[PDB]
Amino acid sequence: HTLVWGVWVNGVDQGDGRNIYIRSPPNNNPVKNLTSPDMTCNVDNRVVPKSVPVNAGDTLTFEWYHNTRDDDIIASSHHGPIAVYIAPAASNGQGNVWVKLFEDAYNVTNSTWAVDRLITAHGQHSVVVPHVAPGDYLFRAEIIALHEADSLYSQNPIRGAQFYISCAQITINSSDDSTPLPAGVPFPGAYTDSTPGIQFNIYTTPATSYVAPPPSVWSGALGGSIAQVGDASLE
Ligand SMILES: OC[C@H]1O[C@@H](O[C@H]2[C@H](O)[C@@H](O)[C@H](O[C@H]3[C@H](O)[C@@H](O)[C@H](O[C@H]4[C@H](O)[C@@H](O)[C@H](O)O[C@@H]4CO)O[C@@H]3CO)O[C@@H]2CO)[C@H](O)[C@@H](O)[C@@H]1O
Ligand SMILES: *[C@@H]1O[C@H](CO)[C@@H](O)[C@H](O)[C@H]1NC(C)=O
Ligand SMILES: [Cl-]
Ligand SMILES: [Cu+2]
């Protein structure tokens, strides 16, 4: 159970974005029905009033929280990967539009899942803004918690993979548009019962054996990281 508070741009806090520039759900309950419209931008997808100004090459940092900003972020039990996707805001998240900018599942070195490191990062994880066409975009951050993904939701609707999905309204101003955005995948649609990384038993199977759901990260993506980029306690 976790939600996005707001974003930082190049380490500068953009302020509380809930229902302002984040398309926030009314609470932190997971999405589990893979076929549901709720997989796009969670259960309350609608245009919110603001969209955060950024340029290509900027560092955009998502800040998640559990109950209060900068608390314990998400329960330790919720081991799993983190992905970020982009789509033209034009799409309202409909059709084959979602392009992956970032994937992080398990780090063999430190033996920590992305979710583990996000708690350590005080809810902060980033992507570098790609050189797409200037315009309006949704950035879709997705945490998959696997603490019950040994089952499928479609078979046993009180278990299943859990998706914490948050869409941010981002306006890209300056960009040489050196990497025009391609078509991508639908949500709902890209993930099915068969897709790798949806059904997995983190109780029995090594986390080195884990394979995150496709698609792969776009060649135009400029990477990203899970790590604190600024101190919410001084805001
Ligand atoms: O630990 C291994 C074990 O996990 C089992 O699943 C557990 C989770 O471990 C546990 O984190 C989870 O806790 C949930 C709880 O069910 C929710 O009711 C609660 O929701 C809160 C929310 O946290 C608040 O922010 C909000 O304000 O209020 C709501 C209450 O409506 O959120 C916590 C997590 O933060 O409970 C799971 C079981 O239900 C697996 O089932 C098991 O297989 C594993 O072995
Ligand atoms: C999942 O979502 C689809 C489409 O929204 C819906 O028809 C179906 O009833 C849902 N599944 C469950 C278990 O509710
Ligand atoms: Cl839970
Ligand atoms: Cu939870």
- 8 A C-beta contact, residue 36 and residue 25: no
- Alpha-carbon distance of 197 to 105, in angstroms, equals 10
**Is 124 annotated as contributing to ligand binding?**
no
Task: Answer yes or no: is the C-beta of 1 below 6 A from any ligand 1 atom.
Answer: yes
User: Which residues touch 185 (CB under 8 Å, ≥6 apart)?
Assistant: 96, 97, 98, 215
Of 55, 56, 7, 3, the C-alpha closest to 27 is: 3
- In the block, residue with structure tokens 């400029």: 222
Residues, the chain: 235
Buried b (16+ CB within 10 A) or exposed e, 27-54: ebebbbebeeebbbbbeebeebeebbeb
Can you read off the two tokens belonging to residue 208? 């080195």
The atom of ligand 1 lying closest to the CA of 78 is 11
From 161, 1, 148, select the one nearest 66 (Cα to Cα): 1
φ, ψ for residue 81, nearest 5 deg:
-85, 170
Among 81, 193, 194, which residue's Cα sits nearest to residue 146? 81
- The rounded distance, in Å, linking the Cα atoms of 18 and 130 is 24
Interval between CA 2 and ligand 4 midpoint (Å): 7
Q: Which bound ligand lies closest to the C-alpha atom of 38? A: 2
User: CA-CA distance, 79 to 105, in Å (whole number)?
Assistant: 9
Q: Which atom of ligand 2 is nearest to the CA of 157?
A: 13
- Domain span at residue 126 reads 2-235
Tokens 């997995």, residue located = 200
Instruction: Tokens for 175, please give them.
Output: 């960009």
| Distance of alpha carbon 133 from alpha carbon 87, whole angstroms | 12
Question: Total structural domains in the chain?
Answer: 1
Going 206 to 155 to 115 to 101, the CA torsion angle's sign is: positive
C-alpha dihedral sign at 86, 33, 152, 149: positive
Domain of 81, CATH number, reads: 2.70.50.70
Question: At residue 100, what are phi and psi to the nearest 5 degrees?
Answer: -80, 130
| Cis omega (within 30 of 0) for bond into 53 | no
Closest CA to 42 of 165, 140, 163: 165
Assess contact for 145 and 79: CB atoms under 8 A. yes
Token digits for 187?
């949500």
Distance of CA 158 to the CA centre of its chain: 23
- In the numeric block, which tokens belong to residue 195? 């897709």
What does the block give as tokens for 4?
């996005």
What the block records as the tokens of 45 is: 């997808």
Nearest to 220 by CA among 140, 130, 138, 97: 130
Q: Whose alpha carbon is nearest atom 7 of ligand 2? A: 36
- State the Cα–Cα distance between residues 221 and 134, nearest whole angstrom: 16
Q: Give whole-number Cα distances, 70 to 60, 63, 177, in Å.
A: 18, 8, 35
Q: Secondary structure of the chain in the HEC alphabet? A: CCEEEEEEECCEECCCCECCCECCCCCCCCECCCCCCHHHHCCCCCCCCCCEEECCCCEEEEEEECCCCCCCCCCCCCCCCEEEEEEEHHHCCCCCCEEEEEEECEECCCCEEHHHHHHHCCCEEEEECCCCCCEEEEEEEEEEECCCCCCCCCCCCCCCCEEEEEEEEEEECCCCCCCCCCCCECCCCCCCCCCCCCCCCCCCCCHHHCCCCCCCCCCCCCCEEECCCCCHHHC
Q: Residue 177: left if φ>0, alpha if ψ -120 to 50, beta else—which one? A: left
**Rounded CA separation 223/45 (Å):** 26
Answer for the pair 104, 81: CB distance below 8 angstroms, yes or no.
yes
The experimental resolution of this structure, in angstroms, equals 1.9
Phi, psi of 194 (to 5 degrees): -85, -25
**Ligand 1 in contact with 72 (CB < 6 A)?**
no
Show the tokens assigned to 130: 């790609």
